[PDB]
Amino acid sequence: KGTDVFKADSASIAQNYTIPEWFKDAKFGIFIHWGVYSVPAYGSEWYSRWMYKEGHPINKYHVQTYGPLTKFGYKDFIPMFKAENFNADEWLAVVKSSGAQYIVPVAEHHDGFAMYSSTFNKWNAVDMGPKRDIIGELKEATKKAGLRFGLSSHRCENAWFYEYGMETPSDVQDTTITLYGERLHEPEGQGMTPYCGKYEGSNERSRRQFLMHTYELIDKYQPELIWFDWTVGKYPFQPTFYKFMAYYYNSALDWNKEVVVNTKFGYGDNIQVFDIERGKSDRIREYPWQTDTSVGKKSWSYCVGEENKSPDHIIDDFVDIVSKNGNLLLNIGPKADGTITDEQKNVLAEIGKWLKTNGEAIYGSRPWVIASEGHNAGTAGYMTDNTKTEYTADDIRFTTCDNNLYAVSLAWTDGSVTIKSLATKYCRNVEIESVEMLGSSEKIDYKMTDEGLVVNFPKNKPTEYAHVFKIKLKGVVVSKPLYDKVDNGCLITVRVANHNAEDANVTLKSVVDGNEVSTQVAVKAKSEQWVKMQNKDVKSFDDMSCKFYFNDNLTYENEFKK
Numbered sequence: 001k002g003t004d005v006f007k008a009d010s011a012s013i014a015q016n017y018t019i020p021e022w023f024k025d026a027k028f029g030i031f032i033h034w035g036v037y038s039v040p041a042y043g044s045e046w047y048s049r050w051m052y053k054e055g056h057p058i059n060k061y062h063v064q065t066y067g068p069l070t071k072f073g074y075k076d077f078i079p080m081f082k083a084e085n086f087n088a089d090e091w092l093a094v095v096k097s098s099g100a101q102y103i104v105p106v107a108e109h110h111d112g113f114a115m116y117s118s119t120f121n122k123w124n125a126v127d128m129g130p131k132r133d134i135i136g137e138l139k140e141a142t143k144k145a146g147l148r149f150g151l152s153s154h155r156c157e158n159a160w161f162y163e164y165g166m167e168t169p170s171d172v173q174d175t176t177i178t179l180y181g182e183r184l185h186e187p188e189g190q191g192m193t194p195y196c197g198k199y200e201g202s203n204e205r206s207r208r209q210f211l212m213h214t215y216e217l218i219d220k221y222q223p224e225l226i227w228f229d230w231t232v233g234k235y236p237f238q239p240t241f242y243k244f245m246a247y248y249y250n251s252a253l254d255w256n257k258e259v260v261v262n263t264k265f266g267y268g269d270n271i272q273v274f275d276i277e278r279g280k281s282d283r284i285r286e287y288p289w290q291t292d293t294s295v296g297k298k299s300w301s302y303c304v305g306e307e308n309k310s311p312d313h314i315i316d317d318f319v320d321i322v323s324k325n326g327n328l329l330l331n332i333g334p335k336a337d338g339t340i341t342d343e344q345k346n347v348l349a350e351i352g353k354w355l356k357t358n359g360e361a362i363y364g365s366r367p368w369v370i371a372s373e374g375h376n377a378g379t380a381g382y383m384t385d386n387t388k389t390e391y392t393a394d395d396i397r398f399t400t401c402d403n404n405l406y407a408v409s410l411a412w413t414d415g416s417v418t419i420k421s422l423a424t425k426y427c428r429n430v431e432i433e434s435v436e437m438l439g440s441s442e443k444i445d446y447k448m449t450d451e452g453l454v455v456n457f458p459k460n461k462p463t464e465y466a467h468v469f470k471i472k473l474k475g476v477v478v479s480k481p482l483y484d485k486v487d488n489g490c491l492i493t494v495r496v497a498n499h500n501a502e503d504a505n506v507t508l509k510s511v512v513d514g515n516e517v518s519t520q521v522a523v524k525a526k527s528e529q530w531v532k533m534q535n536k537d538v539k540s541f542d543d544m545s546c547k548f549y550f551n552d553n554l555t556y557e558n559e560f561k562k
C-alpha cells in the first residue's frame with residue numbers, strides 16, 4: 001500500500017505512535033495458553049524443552065510414559081492433539097462472562113507449532129493436530145462476541161528451545177525436522193535484560209522466519225494486539241523487531257485501527273506497552289503497562305495437579321494493577337481436548353460478577369494522585385505475584401473517572417475506614433459532595449476529619465473480594481512526595497488533582513538540606529498532572545532533611561532517622 005509513516009527505528013516510532021485510548025480504557029484481557037504441550041499435561045508448557053534434557057524430571061517422566069527420545073519425540077504428541085471438544089464461541093462466552101475486553105490466544109509458543117494457517121510453517125494446526133485454524137476461528141468468535149482480538153507470539157525462543165535434544169540421542173538431532181528450530185544455545189543473561197553474552201539467541205534464518213511469522217499473522221488476522229515473549233529484547237534481535245514494529249504500525253494505519261505491542265524489556269515505555277510477567281508495579285507508572293499472569297500458580301498450559309489462585313487473590317491484584325495505570329492480562333489453560341476447566345471457569349465468572357457491580361471504578365478509569373494507602377503494599381515485580389497479600393479494609397486503592405474518585409477497599413469491615421489520602425494537609429478546600437458504595441442501596445454515612453475522610457461501611461456486602469466507594473468531591477489534592485536519588489541531588493515527584501470546576505493555581509515547595517525549590521502550577525478544572533521537582537547540591541541522600549509544602553501547608557517531613 002506504500003504507507004511508510006513508521007520507519008524501523010525507535011525515534012521514528014516515538015515521533016508518531018501513541019498508546020491507544022482503548023487499551024487504557026479496557027483494563028482487562030484473557031490470555032489463553034493452549035497447544036501441543038497440553039496433551040502430556042505434565043509440568044508446564046516448557047515440556048518440549050525439558051523432555052530432551054537427559055536426567056531432568058520431565059525427561060525421565062517422558063521416557064517411562066511415552067518412550068525413548070528416539071521413538072517418541074515432542075512431534076509425536078501432535079496426532080494426539082485432536083481438540084475434539086474445541087469450540088471458539090464457547091471460549092469467547094467464557095472470556096466475555098469474565099468482563100474482559102480483549103482476548104490473547106497463543107498463536108505460537110516456544111515449541112515450533114503454529115496454531116494458525118501458516119504458509120512457511122508446515123508444523124501447524126491446520127494441516128496437523130486439530131486440523132483447523134484455531135486462531136482464525138477465535139478471531140471470528142471474538143468479532144461476534146464484540147471483543148477486541150489479540151494474540152501472542154513466543155516463536156523467538158524456538159531458536160534455542162530444543163538445544164538439549166542435540167546433546168542426547170533424540171529425534172531433534174535429525175536436523176531436517178524444522179519443528180525443533182535452530183537448536184542453538186539459550187542466550188545468556190539473568191531475567192529481563194537485553195544482555196545475551198556469547199549466545200545471541202537467534203540467527204539469520206530464525207530472524208527471517210520471525211518476520212515471515214509476524215507478517216502473516218498481521219496480514220491474515222489483523223490483530224489489535226500482539227504480545228511477544230522475553231527474547232525479542234535481546235540485543236541481536238532488536239533490528240529485526242523494529243522491522244516488525246514499523247510494519248505493524250503502518251498496517252494498522254491502513255486498517256483505521258490502533259494497535260498494541262507488548263514486550264517485557266528492551267524497548268521504550270512510550271513506543272510499546274511494557275509488560276511484567278507474574279508481577280505488578282509498586283508505583284503509578286507514567287505510561288500504560290500490563291501485568292500478564294496465570295490463574296494457575298504452577299503453569300500457563302493445563303497440567304494435572306495445578307493449584308489455581310482464588311478469585312480474591314486475582315481481584316485484589318487486579319485493582320492494585322489498575323490503580324497504577326496497568327492492565328491485567330489473565331491466563332487460563334484449557335485441557336488438551338479444548339475444555340476450559342471448571343475451576344478456571346469459576347474464577348473468570350467470579351471476576352465478571354464483581355465487574356458487573358464495580359466496573360464503573362475500573363473501565364475507562366485513570367490513576368488518581370496516589371494509588372494506595374494502608375499497611376500492606378502488596379507484591380511488586382517480575383515473578384512475585386504467586387504470593388497472596390492478606391489485605392484489610394484499610395488497604396485502599398484509588399482510581400478516578402469523569403472527575404469522580406473511587407476508593408476500593410481490598411477487604412471488608414463491620415466498622416469504618418479513614419481515607420488518609422484525604423487528610424487535611426494534602427487538601428485545599430476539599431468538600432465531599434457525596435459518598436456511595438457501588439451496588440449498595442444503603443446511604444453511606446461519612447465525616448471529613450483532619451486525619452482524612454471517615455467512611456462507615458454499610459450493612460450488606462454488595463460483592464465479595466473488594467468494595468468500591470464512589471466519591472464526588474471538589475477541591476485540590478496533592479499526593480505525598482516520592483523521593484528518588486540522582487547525582488548530587490534528589491528528584492521529587494507528586495501528582496496533583498483539581499476536582500474543582502474552576503481552574504486552580506498551586507504552589508509546591510521542596511526544602512531539602514536548606515535548599516528551597518518552588519514551582520507554581522496551573523491545574524485546569526477536573527484534571528490532574530505529574531509534578532517533578534529537583535533539589536540539587538544534596539551531599540548525602542541517606543542523611544537528607546526533607547520538608548514538602550502544599551501552598552505553604554506542611555505535607556511531609558522526614559522527622560525519623562534512615
Ligand SMILES: OC[C@@H]1O[C@@H](O)[C@@H](O)[C@H](O)[C@@H]1O
Pocket residue numbers: 045046154229230277278292293300
Ligand atoms: O508471560 C507468559 C510466560 O512467558 C514466558 O515466561 C514463557 O516461557 C512462559 O511459558 C509463559 O508464556
Ligand SMILES: [Ca+2]
Pocket residue numbers: 312316391410411465466
Ligand atoms: Ca480482597
